[PDB]
Amino acid sequence: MVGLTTLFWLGAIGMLVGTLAFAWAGRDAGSGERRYYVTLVGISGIAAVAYAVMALGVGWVPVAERTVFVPRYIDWILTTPLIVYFLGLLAGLDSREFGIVITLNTVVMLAGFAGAMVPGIERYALFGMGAVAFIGLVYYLVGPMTESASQRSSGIKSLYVRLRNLTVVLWAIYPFIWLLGPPGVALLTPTVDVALIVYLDLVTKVGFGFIALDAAA
Numbered sequence: 001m002v003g004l005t006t007l008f009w010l011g012a013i014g015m016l017v018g019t020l021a022f023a024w025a026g027r028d029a030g031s032g033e034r035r036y037y038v039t040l041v042g043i044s045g046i047a048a049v050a051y052a053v054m055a056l057g058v059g060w061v062p063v064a065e066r067t068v069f070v071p072r073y074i075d076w077i078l079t080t081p082l083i084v085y086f087l088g089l090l091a092g093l094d095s096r097e098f099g100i101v102i103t104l105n106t107v108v109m110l111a112g113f114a115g116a117m118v119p120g121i122e123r124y125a126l127f128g129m130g131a132v133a134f135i136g137l138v139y140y141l142v143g144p145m146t147e148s149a150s151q152r153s154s155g156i157k158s159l160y161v162r163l164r165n166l167t168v169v170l171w172a173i174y175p176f177i178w179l180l181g182p183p184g185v186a187l188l189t190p191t192v193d194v195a196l197i198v199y200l201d202l203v204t205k206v207g208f209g210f211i212a213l214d215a216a217a
């Protein structure tokens, strides 16, 4: 499909501009803030690589009567934790709390990946595992991580809240897409499925980064 490839290109391109943009803004940054710029460049860069790889025809593996794009999940497993890290730096979390939110994040990504890789109905069981871990992650986001961020300057306090809403609201859509897309009910075509994910991936990553750069000043 030529349509799947262009959607992948659009993604790689959109991520590229995000990266270059963040790497530029990150250029010349204090020895106590570069961490943000550099993590933002990783979130964007990794995704860009993953998209170009898929655009090029790599990772399109068949499972049952569908095809699963492995580079998407590899990306997710590597990038979502960085997003949570970033959010964590804002909130002012320590190793303890960081550690908790990160693993909870990894379980849902690992479970989603495993789930999409199995042909049998037990895939729903794997999906269900990620579902419960995600509600947990969201709990920590709007809960303890929030109260924890309420101790920063009015500036940081407001940036975190905008980013967590953006995050929580958009991420909650992914599972439903998975459920309706080919991995589950396949009530959604691969192409629409991919178009939707590309958009979400872009906003929750590059959209995320730009909102942060705006705040930087």
Ligand SMILES: *C/C=C(C)/C=C/C=C(C)/C=C/C1=C(C)CCCC1(C)C
Pocket (backbone or CB within 6 Å): 047, 076, 079, 080, 108, 109, 111, 112, 113, 127, 128, 130, 131, 134, 171, 172, 174, 175, 178, 201, 204, 205
């Ligand atoms: C840059 C990529 C991002 C922000 C990807 C986010 C993906 C999710 C929030 C996926 C969530 C899922 C569940 C909550 C249930 C298990 C199945 C998944 C992996 C689709």
